[PDB]
Amino acid sequence: DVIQRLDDLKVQRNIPRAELLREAVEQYLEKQDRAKDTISSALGLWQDCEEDGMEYQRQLRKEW
Amino acid sequence: DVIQRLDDLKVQRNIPRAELLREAVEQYLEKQDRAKDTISSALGLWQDCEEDGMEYQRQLRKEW
Amino acid sequence: GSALFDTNILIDLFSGRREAKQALEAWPPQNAISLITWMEVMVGAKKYHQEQRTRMALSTFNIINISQDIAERSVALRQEYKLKLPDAIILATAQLHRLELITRNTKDFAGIPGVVTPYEIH
Amino acid sequence: GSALFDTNILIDLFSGRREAKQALEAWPPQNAISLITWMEVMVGAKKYHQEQRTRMALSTFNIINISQDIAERSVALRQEYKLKLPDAIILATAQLHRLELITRNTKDFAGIPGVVTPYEIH
């Protein structure tokens, strides 16, 4: 039924279903790329932070 | 920019100022003792509770 | 002269302290509490099995949710005054809405503008 | 199929642990954090002076505010699993958005459905 929505999508678009997937697959992979980018620059973003995250957490749950 | 609301309430009502003032004062009083009722209703609701407020607060503050 | 009441005062009231009744009467309705306070009071409402009646009393308060710029102020207040995070959030809530913060906690809140200490434990 | 991430994993990420990097890449974007986590992380950013760029990394997440119905769930969850209030709020956020909860806290969260622990350290 993903195949049906694909070809009634295709009525509108005038494009082979394989470009509908190399649309679908593409955009998705680009979305994953963006995440990878953000996470990579965050690591490690705190220059001078040696703290363990779980230790950190336990402190602020008891709030310092 | 205050009482030139009220003297036009005189023409938007056709009732004296000395009336408009009473309704105001009486609605105020009415609002206050709905609170005095709520507050008096909530006093000792937890009866069987010997727990102090700060220590309670400091307890769940810390972690809980 | 609107009022935001800290958790310890509401707890005092439900526990039957007349000092809290006097604290809540000392300010014009409708008064306010943070969502943080609502939750911590409901913890006690459940333990003591007053849940429906407490929820009834609490709903007469303006109940202010924690949103992005209460959170914004909260982070800032926490460093300026060296505050515990929930303390900072309740203080941030008061500031943003221009409410007096009424709390029994002097240790943390003394020297902080817009905060009133109503009464004392022995 | 998305997850909500606890503060400890985000702290580990900014602190330079690949363990946290992999834990995040193990779930699809857009991921989510509680507004509580946002505050916890932004406190550390100040300490370490990255506050602007940390704010930009957090913005990629879905920052879920603390609502009245999240408050009601947290109250219940706190009693059920004997959770601290912030932990209950974060668990409540994940349940009401029907997200998996990713955390390194195995002490409090083990035996609770929908809670996954990606990695361990000393």
Side-chain angles (χ1 to χ4, degrees), chain A residues 1 3-50 52-64, chain B residues 1-50 52-64, chain C residues 1-121, chain D residues 1-121:
Chain A
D1 300 75
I3 61 103
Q4 136 205 294
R5 270 159 61 175
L6 250 41
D7 317 327
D8 259 357
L9 168 61
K10 234 193 307 182
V11 161
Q12 319 180 325
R13 282 286 305 278
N14 151 37
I15 188 86
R17 195 170 89 266
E19 177 80 33
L20 283 179
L21 256 69
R22 65 179 77 94
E23 269 175 342
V25 166
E26 181 66 13
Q27 271 143 65
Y28 175 83
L29 292 177
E30 159 208 353
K31 184 187 190 180
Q32 316 300 304
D33 276 33
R34 262 191 296 271
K36 133 175 170 158
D37 192 282
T38 306
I39 297 180
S40 291
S41 287
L43 174 102
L45 180 63
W46 298 348
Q47 139 197 6
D48 74 1
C49 176
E50 272 82 316
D52 191 54
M54 270 300 299
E55 300 174 351
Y56 182 104
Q57 185 96 82
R58 192 70 216 91
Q59 274 294 88
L60 188 93
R61 297 284 160 99
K62 192 165 179 317
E63 30 224 269
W64 177 100
Chain B
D1 316 283
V2 168
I3 303 175
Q4 191 181 351
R5 303 209 102 98
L6 288 168
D7 288 276
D8 326 273
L9 259 201
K10 184 97 183 266
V11 66
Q12 286 179 56
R13 290 290 289 279
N14 192 29
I15 320 186
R17 295 146 38 65
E19 251 132 21
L20 306 182
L21 245 70
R22 178 203 180 131
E23 297 178 354
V25 171
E26 85 91 33
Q27 278 167 28
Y28 179 82
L29 223 63
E30 206 138 271
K31 195 176 167 223
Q32 303 313 301
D33 312 295
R34 261 187 293 267
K36 269 68 180 181
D37 166 78
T38 287
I39 299 172
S40 303
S41 170
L43 186 70
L45 181 71
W46 287 7
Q47 175 225 352
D48 290 319
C49 178
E50 303 168 349
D52 179 72
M54 255 329 284
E55 310 202 20
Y56 182 111
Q57 172 154 326
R58 287 201 294 271
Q59 268 172 247
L60 304 232
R61 279 320 151 89
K62 285 162 17 213
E63 73 280 13
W64 314 123
Chain C
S2 288
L4 183 95
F5 284 90
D6 198 4
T7 310
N8 54 264
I9 296 183
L10 282 183
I11 294 299
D12 260 356
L13 173 78
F14 290 120
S15 298
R17 303 226 187 187
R18 194 182 171 81
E19 293 94 333
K21 172 167 171 295
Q22 293 183 346
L24 282 168
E25 290 179 3
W27 299 84
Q30 179 189 50
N31 290 319
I33 54 170
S34 173
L35 196 47
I36 292 200
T37 293
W38 190 92
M39 292 188 265
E40 291 202 24
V41 172
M42 288 306 297
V43 159
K46 287 206 167 169
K47 161 149 64 171
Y48 291 105
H49 312 129
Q50 286 307 316
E51 186 165 322
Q52 174 81 256
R53 260 161 272 167
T54 301
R55 166 154 22 79
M56 280 178 180
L58 290 184
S59 62
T60 70
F61 287 84
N62 177 19
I63 302 175
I64 311 183
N65 306 325
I66 308 124
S67 61
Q68 183 60 58
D69 269 34
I70 279 166
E72 210 68 64
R73 178 63 62 80
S74 298
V75 173
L77 283 177
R78 187 177 150 301
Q79 186 66 274
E80 198 193 2
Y81 294 119
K82 305 204 197 230
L83 284 166
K84 306 190 196 67
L85 180 58
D87 275 340
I89 295 170
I90 286 173
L91 182 55
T93 296
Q95 293 195 347
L96 288 209
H97 289 83
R98 322 151 295 152
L99 317 179
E100 188 79 25
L101 180 53
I102 312 98
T103 175
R104 252 189 287 99
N105 186 7
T106 62
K107 187 174 162 332
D108 296 328
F109 277 106
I112 301 179
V115 184
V116 157
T117 180
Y119 54 99
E120 182 66 32
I121 62 108
Chain D
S2 272
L4 185 127
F5 285 76
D6 208 2
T7 294
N8 62 80
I9 294 167
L10 259 174
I11 302 304
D12 286 330
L13 176 63
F14 296 116
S15 300
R17 284 200 152 111
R18 187 178 188 92
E19 302 78 337
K21 167 189 184 279
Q22 294 169 2
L24 283 142
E25 281 166 350
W27 302 80
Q30 181 187 99
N31 285 316
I33 61 172
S34 173
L35 187 59
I36 288 214
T37 291
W38 191 91
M39 285 179 295
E40 308 200 316
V41 173
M42 289 301 294
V43 155
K46 186 192 300 299
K47 187 170 332 178
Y48 299 116
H49 294 73
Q50 283 302 357
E51 191 158 53
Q52 227 199 331
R53 287 195 182 167
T54 302
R55 198 183 251 104
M56 276 188 271
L58 287 172
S59 73
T60 53
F61 293 81
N62 179 25
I63 308 169
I64 305 175
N65 291 331
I66 313 137
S67 54
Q68 175 59 64
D69 293 327
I70 271 188
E72 157 76 278
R73 182 59 65 84
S74 319
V75 170
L77 286 182
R78 167 163 196 291
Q79 275 221 358
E80 294 175 8
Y81 294 126
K82 308 303 176 51
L83 285 166
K84 289 134 41 54
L85 183 51
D87 300 278
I89 289 169
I90 290 162
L91 179 61
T93 305
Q95 283 180 3
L96 287 179
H97 284 248
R98 319 169 306 296
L99 306 173
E100 207 80 1
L101 173 58
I102 320 296
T103 175
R104 289 175 54 191
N105 184 351
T106 66
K107 233 216 157 176
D108 309 325
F109 289 108
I112 304 176
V115 184
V116 172
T117 308
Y119 64 89
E120 76 163 324
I121 321 206

